[PDB]
Amino acid sequence: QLSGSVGPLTSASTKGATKTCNILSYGAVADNSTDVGPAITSAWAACKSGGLVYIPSGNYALNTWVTLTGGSATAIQLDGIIYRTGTASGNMIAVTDTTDFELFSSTSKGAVQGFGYVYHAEGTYGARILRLTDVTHFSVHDIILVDAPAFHFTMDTCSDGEVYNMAIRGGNEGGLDGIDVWGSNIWVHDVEVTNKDECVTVKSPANNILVESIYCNWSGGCAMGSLGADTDVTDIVYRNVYTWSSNQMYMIKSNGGSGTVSNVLLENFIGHGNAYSLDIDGYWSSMTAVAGDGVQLNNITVKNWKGTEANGATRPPIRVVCSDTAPCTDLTLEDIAIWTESGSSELYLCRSAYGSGYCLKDSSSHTSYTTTSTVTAAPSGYSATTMAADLATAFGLTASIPIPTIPTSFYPGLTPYSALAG
Numbered sequence: 007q008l009s010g011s012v013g014p015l016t017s018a019s020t021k022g023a024t025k026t027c028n029i030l031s032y033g034a035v036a037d038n039s040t041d042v043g044p045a046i047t048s049a050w051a052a053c054k055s056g057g058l059v060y061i062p063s064g065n066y067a068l069n070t071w072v073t074l075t076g077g078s079a080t081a082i083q084l085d086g087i088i089y090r091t092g093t094a095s096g097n098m099i100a101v102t103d104t105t106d107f108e109l110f111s112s113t114s115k116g117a118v119q120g121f122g123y124v125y126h127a128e129g130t131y132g133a134r135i136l137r138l139t140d141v142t143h144f145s146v147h148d149i150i151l152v153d154a155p156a157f158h159f160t161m162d163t164c165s166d167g168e169v170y171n172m173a174i175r176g177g178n179e180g181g182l183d184g185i186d187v188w189g190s191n192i193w194v195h196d197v198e199v200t201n202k203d204e205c206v207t208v209k210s211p212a213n214n215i216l217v218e219s220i221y222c223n224w225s226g227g228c229a230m231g232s233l234g235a236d237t238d239v240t241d242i243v244y245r246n247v248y249t250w251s252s253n254q255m256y257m258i259k260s261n262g263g264s265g266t267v268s269n270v271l272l273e274n275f276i277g278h279g280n281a282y283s284l285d286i287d288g289y290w291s292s293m294t295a296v297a298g299d300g301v302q303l304n305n306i307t308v309k310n311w312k313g314t315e316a317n318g319a320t321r322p323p324i325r326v327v328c329s330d331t332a333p334c335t336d337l338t339l340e341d342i343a344i345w346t347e348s349g350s351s352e353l354y355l356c357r358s359a360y361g362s363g364y365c366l367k368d369s370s371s372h373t374s375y376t377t378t379s380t381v382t383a384a385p386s387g388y389s390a391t392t393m394a395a396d397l398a399t400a401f402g403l404t405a406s407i408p409i410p411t412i413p414t415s416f417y418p419g420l421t422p423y424s425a426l427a428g
């Protein structure tokens with residue numbers, strides 16, 4: 007949950023009035039051929055303190071990556087489309103050590119076409135599209151990120167930020183994270199993600215993060231981690247998350263390590279067609295083990311989950327696997343009604359976890375244990391609707407991905423918090 011106000015300190019109109027650096031004035035050519043990188047860099051240099059970097063409608067080729075740093079009361083208005091032509095590694099666009107910042111499109115049509123499929127068709131990965139590091143008092147909204155060669159959007163140690171009204175659509179494989187975030191006091195809402203890895207995921211250290219109205223439309227799903235040594239994650243809320251045809255509805259992953267994860271609320275989730283549903287995994291096999299007794303998870307509430315999973319017999323819809331040497335404590339599982347899409351039974355798995363709900367123990371002696379429960383009849387009230395835009399098929403790995411429009415519907419029965427800019 008947020009600890010204070012988020013977003014830029016001054017409006018884009020105020021910054022624009024101070025000074026507008028139109029990239030066409032810094033050598034940019036909207037010919038979908040001439041490298042726009044240098045122009046953005048020169049425009050930033052002139053407008054990074056109090057001004058606004060403006061990218062008018064048109065098609066631009068990005069051949070060399072840009073690293074924009076040291077801004078103060080600045081903004082970038084992306085009203086055109088950037089196409090990746092560069093082949094270097096790294097981040098196509100990186101904004102670092104900047105305060106009072108806004109990255110947006112006034113038309114709700116600004117986009118970055120990463121052409122990640124060129125790499126994926128060959129079994130490889132390329133640059134990430136966007137990375138914000140140590141950015142404070144900011145907002146990123148009304149933009150579209152498509153087919154990143156690797157990650158789409160990472161917020162590395164940022165704070166007092168708001169991210170919303172975005173569509174992120176990437177390839178159908180792991181390694182193509184949607185939004186990865188760590189820092190403090192960040193509000194993410196009204197975002198749709200397609201890929202086969204992180205939907206909106208929190209990493210350590212992080213405190214006071216609110217994530218809601220998220221539409222994981224064929225994705226890896228939301229998660230927390232991987233968590234390792236010296237973990238410190240606290241006051242995290244995810245609510246009103248709709249997940250379709252994904253790896254999971256929510257996963258907390260660690261494998262050894264230390265530190266603590268506390269005060270997490272995951273409520274109002276709906277899922278259909280996923281591999282896993284609730285998957286707390288303290289022995290996540292996809293990551294090499296970290297020295298320590300295990301990250302201590304405490305006071306985690308999972309409430310009001312409904313829907314169906316592809317196969318609840320092979321993948322327990324309720325899977326709570328904690329460290330035997332660092333038992334989960336104070337977990338509250340309440341009103342989780344998930345049923346299986348094939349078969350007539352499903353399993354609930356609990357390992358060394360304490361609290362109240364389903365297979366959890368409410369004991370005093372937090373010793374380890376392993377238990378499996380077979381449910382032979384559909385939990386009452388598992389029925390939940392679907393979203394009209396649920397993908398019938400994903401975008402593969404060998405053909406370009408068409409640029410989507412930003413939707414105005416993310417979770418059943420709710421409307422977006424903020425109207426689209428255009």
Ligand SMILES: *[C@@H]1O[C@H](CO)[C@@H](O[C@@H]2O[C@H](CO)[C@@H](O[C@@H]3O[C@H](CO[C@@H]4O[C@H](CO)[C@@H](O)[C@H](O)[C@@H]4O)[C@@H](O)[C@H](O[C@H]4O[C@H](CO)[C@@H](O)[C@H](O)[C@@H]4O)[C@@H]3O)[C@H](O)[C@H]2NC(C)=O)[C@H](O)[C@H]1NC(C)=O
Pocket residue numbers: 038065067089090091121124406
């Ligand atoms: C901005 O600039 C970017 C480049 O950075 C443009 O992206 C390229 O767009 C063009 C289309 O305008 C793409 O080329 C066409 O791709 C077609 C599909 O790809 C092929 O698929 C077949 C079958 O799977 C394979 O055999 C090929 O190996 C390719 O993978 C392709 O079929 C087509 O080929 C035919 O092109 C012309 C006209 O169709 C024929 O005359 C020619 O003989 C050939 O047979 C094109 O090559 C190109 O792939 C895109 N680049 C990338 C990286 O995706 C944007 O389109 C530009 N945007 C704007 C708005 O201008």
Ligand SMILES: *[C@@H]1O[C@H](CO)[C@@H](O[C@@H]2O[C@H](CO)[C@@H](O[C@@H]3O[C@H](CO)[C@@H](O)[C@H](O)[C@@H]3O)[C@H](O)[C@H]2NC(C)=O)[C@H](O)[C@H]1NC(C)=O
Pocket residue numbers: 007243268269270271305307
């Ligand atoms: C376990 O974790 C939960 C969060 O996951 C903690 O809940 C939070 O507890 C506080 C106090 O009970 C709730 O009250 C809030 O207080 C502030 C300031 O007074 C006020 O601004 C809010 O309007 C609200 O009243 C807070 O809302 C609640 N968080 C959520 C998301 O509901 C809980 O305290 C932890 N329990 C233990 C034993 O540590």
Ligand SMILES: *[C@@H]1O[C@H](CO)[C@@H](O)[C@H](O)[C@@H]1O
Pocket residue numbers: 330357358374375376377
């Ligand atoms: C259950 O017992 C211990 C924990 O209590 C596990 O380590 C073991 O794998 C079994 O499933």
Ligand SMILES: *[C@@H]1O[C@H](CO)[C@@H](O)[C@H](O)[C@@H]1O
Pocket residue numbers: 353355376377378379
């Ligand atoms: C629950 O049962 C499953 C098999 O159905 C085991 O894999 C697990 O360790 C626990 O005993």
Ligand SMILES: *[C@@H]1O[C@H](CO)[C@@H](O)[C@H](O)[C@@H]1O
Pocket residue numbers: 381382383
């Ligand atoms: C499956 O259905 C009933 C529902 O009451 C279960 O309680 C029982 O275990 C059976 O095998």
Ligand SMILES: *[C@H]1O[C@H](CO)[C@@H](O)[C@H](O)[C@@H]1O
Pocket residue numbers: 367369371372373374375
């Ligand atoms: C760990 O071991 C103790 C004693 O066997 C139990 O009381 C507890 O429920 C858990 O199985």
Ligand SMILES: *[C@H]1O[C@H](CO)[C@@H](O)[C@H](O)[C@@H]1O
Pocket residue numbers: 330331373374375
């Ligand atoms: C879980 O782990 C404890 C020790 O950490 C054992 O006592 C128990 O038998 C199970 O393996």
Ligand SMILES: *[C@H]1O[C@H](CO)[C@@H](O)[C@H](O)[C@@H]1O
Pocket residue numbers: 365376377378379
């Ligand atoms: C999980 O389920 C098994 C069998 O129902 C129990 O024996 C165990 O104590 C835990 O409740």
Ligand SMILES: *[C@H]1O[C@H](CO)[C@@H](O)[C@H](O)[C@@H]1O
Pocket residue numbers: 354364365366377378379380381
């Ligand atoms: C298997 O056991 C769990 C508790 O261990 C029940 O919640 C479930 O209904 C099934 O009987």
Ligand SMILES: *[C@H]1O[C@H](CO)[C@@H](O)[C@H](O)[C@@H]1O
Pocket residue numbers: 378379380381
């Ligand atoms: C459910 O519980 C056990 C867990 O060991 C399953 O293996 C069995 O099929 C039962 O129905």
Ligand SMILES: *[C@H]1O[C@H](CO)[C@@H](O)[C@H](O)[C@@H]1O
Pocket residue numbers: 386387
């Ligand atoms: C069956 O029972 C559940 C609570 O366990 C309700 O949520 C549902 O509406 C139905 O009455």
Ligand SMILES: *[C@H]1O[C@H](CO)[C@@H](O)[C@H](O)[C@@H]1O
Pocket residue numbers: 390391392
């Ligand atoms: C699932 O059900 C809801 C109402 O419960 C509809 O609004 C939706 O279109 C879908 O049919």
Ligand SMILES: *[C@H]1O[C@H](CO)[C@@H](O)[C@H](O)[C@@H]1O
Pocket residue numbers: 389390391392
């Ligand atoms: C079960 O009930 C829900 C809402 O009550 C529907 O949306 C779903 O399609 C199914 O009929």
Ligand SMILES: *[C@H]1O[C@H](CO)[C@@H](O)[C@H](O)[C@@H]1O
Pocket residue numbers: 391392393394395396
């Ligand atoms: C999800 O699926 C239901 C039917 O199962 C539709 O009513 C809804 O529009 C969406 O396609």
Ligand SMILES: *[C@H]1O[C@H](CO)[C@@H](O)[C@H](O)[C@@H]1O
Pocket residue numbers: 402403404405
């Ligand atoms: C690209 O990947 C292969 C061809 O390399 C196709 O099977 C797939 O449908 C996509 O067009």
Ligand SMILES: *[C@H]1O[C@H](CO)[C@@H](O)[C@H](O)[C@@H]1O
Pocket residue numbers: 405406407408409
């Ligand atoms: C992927 O990208 C290429 C180039 O923009 C298009 O030709 C194709 O239709 C898809 O949008």
